[PDB]
mmCIF file of C-alpha atoms in Angstrom:
data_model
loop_
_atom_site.group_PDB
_atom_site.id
_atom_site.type_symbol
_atom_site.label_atom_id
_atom_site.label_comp_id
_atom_site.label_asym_id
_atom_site.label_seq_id
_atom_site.Cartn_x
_atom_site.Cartn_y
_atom_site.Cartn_z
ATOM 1 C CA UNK E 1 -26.147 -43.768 -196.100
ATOM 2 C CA UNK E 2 -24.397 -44.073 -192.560
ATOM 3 C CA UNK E 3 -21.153 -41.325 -193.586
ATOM 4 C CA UNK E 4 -19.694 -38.558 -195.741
ATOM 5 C CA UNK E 5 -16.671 -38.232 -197.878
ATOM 6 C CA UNK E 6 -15.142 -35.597 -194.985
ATOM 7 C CA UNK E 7 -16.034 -39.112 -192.322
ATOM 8 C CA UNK E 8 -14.463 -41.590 -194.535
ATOM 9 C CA UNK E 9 -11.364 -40.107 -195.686
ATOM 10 C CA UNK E 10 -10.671 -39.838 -191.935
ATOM 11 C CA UNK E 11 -9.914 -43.278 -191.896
ATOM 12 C CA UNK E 12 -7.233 -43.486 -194.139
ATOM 13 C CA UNK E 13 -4.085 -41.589 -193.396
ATOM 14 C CA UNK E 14 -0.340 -42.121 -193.558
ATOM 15 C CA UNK E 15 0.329 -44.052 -190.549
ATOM 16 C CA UNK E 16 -2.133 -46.070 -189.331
ATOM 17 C CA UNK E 17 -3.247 -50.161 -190.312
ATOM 18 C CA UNK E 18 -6.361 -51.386 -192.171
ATOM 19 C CA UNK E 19 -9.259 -53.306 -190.621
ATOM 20 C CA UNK E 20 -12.182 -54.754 -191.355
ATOM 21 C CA UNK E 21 -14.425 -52.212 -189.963
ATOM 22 C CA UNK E 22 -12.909 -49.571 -192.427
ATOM 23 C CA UNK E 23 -14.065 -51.514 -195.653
ATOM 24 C CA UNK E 24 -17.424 -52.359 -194.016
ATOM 25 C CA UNK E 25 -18.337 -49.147 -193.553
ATOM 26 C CA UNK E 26 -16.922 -48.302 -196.919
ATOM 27 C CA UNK E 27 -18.990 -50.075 -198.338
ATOM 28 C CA UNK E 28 -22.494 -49.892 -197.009
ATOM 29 C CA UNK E 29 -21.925 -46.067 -197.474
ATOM 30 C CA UNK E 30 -21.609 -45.898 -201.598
ATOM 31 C CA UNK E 31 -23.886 -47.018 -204.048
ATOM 32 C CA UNK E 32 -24.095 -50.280 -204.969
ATOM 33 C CA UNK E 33 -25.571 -50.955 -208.251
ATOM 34 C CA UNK E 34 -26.567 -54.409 -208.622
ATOM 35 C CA UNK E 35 -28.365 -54.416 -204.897
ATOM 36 C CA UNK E 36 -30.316 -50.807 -205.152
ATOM 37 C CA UNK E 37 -31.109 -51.622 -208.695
ATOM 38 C CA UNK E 38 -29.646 -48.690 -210.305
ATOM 39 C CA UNK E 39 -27.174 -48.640 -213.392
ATOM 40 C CA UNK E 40 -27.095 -45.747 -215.230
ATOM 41 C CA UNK E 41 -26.959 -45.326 -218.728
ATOM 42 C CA UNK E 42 -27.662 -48.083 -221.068
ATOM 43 C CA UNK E 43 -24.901 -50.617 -222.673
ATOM 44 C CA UNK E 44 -24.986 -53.417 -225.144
ATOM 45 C CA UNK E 45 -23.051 -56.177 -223.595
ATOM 46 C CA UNK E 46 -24.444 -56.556 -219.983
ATOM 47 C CA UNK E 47 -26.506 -58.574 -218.470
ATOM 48 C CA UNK E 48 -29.891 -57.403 -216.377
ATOM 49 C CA UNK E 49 -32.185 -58.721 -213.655
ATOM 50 C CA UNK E 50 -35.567 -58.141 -213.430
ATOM 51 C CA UNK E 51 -36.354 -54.503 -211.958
ATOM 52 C CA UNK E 52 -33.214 -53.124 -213.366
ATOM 53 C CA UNK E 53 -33.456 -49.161 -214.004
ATOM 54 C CA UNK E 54 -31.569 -47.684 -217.120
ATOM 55 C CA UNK E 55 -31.207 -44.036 -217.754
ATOM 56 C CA UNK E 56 -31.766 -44.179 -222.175
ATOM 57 C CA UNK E 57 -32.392 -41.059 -224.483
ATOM 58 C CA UNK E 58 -34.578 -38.650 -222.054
ATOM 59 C CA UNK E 59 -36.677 -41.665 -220.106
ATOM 60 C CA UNK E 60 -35.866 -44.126 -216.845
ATOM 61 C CA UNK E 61 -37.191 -47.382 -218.050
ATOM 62 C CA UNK E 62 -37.457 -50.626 -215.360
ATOM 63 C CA UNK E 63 -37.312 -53.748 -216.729
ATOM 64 C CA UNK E 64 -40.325 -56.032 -217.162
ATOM 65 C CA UNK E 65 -38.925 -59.426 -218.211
ATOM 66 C CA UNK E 66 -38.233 -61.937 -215.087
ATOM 67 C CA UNK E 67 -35.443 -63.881 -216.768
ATOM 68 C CA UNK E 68 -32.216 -62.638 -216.951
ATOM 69 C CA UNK E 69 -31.368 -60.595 -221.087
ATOM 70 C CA UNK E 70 -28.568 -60.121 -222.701
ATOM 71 C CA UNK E 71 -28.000 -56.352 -223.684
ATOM 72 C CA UNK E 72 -28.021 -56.958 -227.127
ATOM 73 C CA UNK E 73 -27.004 -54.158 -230.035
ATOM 74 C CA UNK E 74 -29.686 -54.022 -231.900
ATOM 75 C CA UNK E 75 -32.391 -53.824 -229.108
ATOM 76 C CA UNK E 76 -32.245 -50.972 -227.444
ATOM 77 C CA UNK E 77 -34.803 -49.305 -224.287
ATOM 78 C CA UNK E 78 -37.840 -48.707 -226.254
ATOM 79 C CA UNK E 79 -37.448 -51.150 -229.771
ATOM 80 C CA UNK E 80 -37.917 -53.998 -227.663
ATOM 81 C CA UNK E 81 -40.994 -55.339 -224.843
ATOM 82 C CA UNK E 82 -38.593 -55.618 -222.243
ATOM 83 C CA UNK E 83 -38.490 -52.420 -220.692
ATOM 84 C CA UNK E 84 -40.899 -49.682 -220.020
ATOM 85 C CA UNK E 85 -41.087 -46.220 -219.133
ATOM 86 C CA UNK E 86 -44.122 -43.698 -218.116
ATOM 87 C CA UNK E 87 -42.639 -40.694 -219.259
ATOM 88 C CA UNK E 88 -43.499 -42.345 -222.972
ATOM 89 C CA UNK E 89 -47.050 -43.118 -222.222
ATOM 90 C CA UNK E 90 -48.254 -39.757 -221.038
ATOM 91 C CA UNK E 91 -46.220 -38.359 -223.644
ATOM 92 C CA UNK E 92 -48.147 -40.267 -226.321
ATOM 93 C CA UNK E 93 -51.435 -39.990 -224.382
ATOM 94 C CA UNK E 94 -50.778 -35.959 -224.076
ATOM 95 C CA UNK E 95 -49.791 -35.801 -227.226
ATOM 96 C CA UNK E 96 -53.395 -37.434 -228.278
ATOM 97 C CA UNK E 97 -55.282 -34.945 -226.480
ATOM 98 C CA UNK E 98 -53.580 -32.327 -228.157
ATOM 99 C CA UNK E 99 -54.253 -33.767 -231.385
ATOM 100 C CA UNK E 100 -58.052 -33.932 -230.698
ATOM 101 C CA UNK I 1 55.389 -32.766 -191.465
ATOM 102 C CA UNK I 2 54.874 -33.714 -195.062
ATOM 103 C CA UNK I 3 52.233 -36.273 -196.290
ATOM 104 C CA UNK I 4 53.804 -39.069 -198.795
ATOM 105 C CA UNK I 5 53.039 -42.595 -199.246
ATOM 106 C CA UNK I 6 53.147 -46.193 -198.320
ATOM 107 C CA UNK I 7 55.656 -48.729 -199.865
ATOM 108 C CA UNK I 8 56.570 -52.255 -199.301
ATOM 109 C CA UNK I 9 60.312 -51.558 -199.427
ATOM 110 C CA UNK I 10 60.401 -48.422 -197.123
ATOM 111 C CA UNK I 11 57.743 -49.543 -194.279
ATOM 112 C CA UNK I 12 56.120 -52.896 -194.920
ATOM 113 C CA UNK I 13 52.711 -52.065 -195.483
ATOM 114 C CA UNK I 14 51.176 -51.740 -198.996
ATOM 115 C CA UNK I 15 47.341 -50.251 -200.654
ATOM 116 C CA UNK I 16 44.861 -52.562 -200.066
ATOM 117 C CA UNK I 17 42.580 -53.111 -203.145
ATOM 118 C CA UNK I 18 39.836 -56.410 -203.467
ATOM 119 C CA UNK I 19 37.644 -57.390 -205.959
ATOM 120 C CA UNK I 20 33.858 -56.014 -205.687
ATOM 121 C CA UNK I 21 31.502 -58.874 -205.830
ATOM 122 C CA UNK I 22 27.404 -57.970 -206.709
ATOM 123 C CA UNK I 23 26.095 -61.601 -205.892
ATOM 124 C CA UNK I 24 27.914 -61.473 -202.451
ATOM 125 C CA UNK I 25 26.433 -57.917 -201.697
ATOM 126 C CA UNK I 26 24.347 -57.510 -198.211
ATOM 127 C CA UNK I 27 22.519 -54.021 -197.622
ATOM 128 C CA UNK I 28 22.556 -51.676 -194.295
ATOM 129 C CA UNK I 29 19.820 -49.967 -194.665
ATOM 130 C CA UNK I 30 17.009 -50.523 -192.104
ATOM 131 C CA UNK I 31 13.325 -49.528 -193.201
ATOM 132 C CA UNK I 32 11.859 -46.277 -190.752
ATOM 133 C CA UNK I 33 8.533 -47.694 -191.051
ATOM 134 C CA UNK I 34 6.425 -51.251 -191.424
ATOM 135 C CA UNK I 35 3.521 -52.885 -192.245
ATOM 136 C CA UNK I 36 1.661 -49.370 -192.209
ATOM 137 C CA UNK I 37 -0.163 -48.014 -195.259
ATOM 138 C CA UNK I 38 2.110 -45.539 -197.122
ATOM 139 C CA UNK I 39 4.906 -48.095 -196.755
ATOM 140 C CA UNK I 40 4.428 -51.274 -198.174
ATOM 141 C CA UNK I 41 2.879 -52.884 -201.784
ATOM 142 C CA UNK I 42 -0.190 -53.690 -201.968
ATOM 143 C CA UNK I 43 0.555 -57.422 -201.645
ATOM 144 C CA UNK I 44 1.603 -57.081 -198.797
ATOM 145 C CA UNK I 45 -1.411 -55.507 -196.670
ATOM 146 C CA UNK I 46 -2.067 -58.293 -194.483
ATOM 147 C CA UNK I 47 -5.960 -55.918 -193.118
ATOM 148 C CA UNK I 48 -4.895 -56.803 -189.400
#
């Protein structure tokens, strides 16, 4: 949040020496995506926390279950009651109205 | 003057030819830079 890519690659040329301060600031300023909760698109094999956010087929779904899951293959965003999305509600509840 | 060579029998001095050794061998070559990133392996970045 605190720099830009222009601010940090001033800090590492040819000639100078690392430091501390370099790495700290290095990394506060990317995203880190077990703290901000945010991991992109779905994969079997991981492991999630509650309030994880997955990017699957068209939809952001958070995660509802307070234990931690194994990503399994055969449950995906949308089979399963772990996550949810609201982008699926409305669409079924617009879709209703539409029907009637 | 004309060039020619060195013999044992005419002067007393001779070619002088020894054994190269690799085990024995000691460099002279002094590194420009140190401790500096650009310079070293990555092992060896102390983060002063």
């Amino acid at each position: 949040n605190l720099r830009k890519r222009n601010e940090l690659k001033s800090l590492f040329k040819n000639k100078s020496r690392l430091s501390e301060t370099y790495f700290v600031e290095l990394i506060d300023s990317t995203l880190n995506k077990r703290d901000d909760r945010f991991h992109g698109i779905w994969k079997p094999g991981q492991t999630y926390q509650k309030g994880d956010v997955v990017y699957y087929n068209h939809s952001l779904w958070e995660m509802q279950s307070e234990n931690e899951i194994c990503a399994k293959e055969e449950q995906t965003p949308g089979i399963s009651t772990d996550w949810k999305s609201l982008l699926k509600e409305l669409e079924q509840k617009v879709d209703k109205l539409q029907h009637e | 003057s004309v060039i020619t060579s060195v013999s044992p029998k005419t002067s007393n001095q001779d070619h002088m030819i020894e054994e190269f050794i690799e085990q024995a061998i000691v460099f002279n070559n002094q590194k420009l830079e140190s401790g500096v990133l650009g310079y070293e392996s990555l092992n060896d970045l102390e983060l002063g």
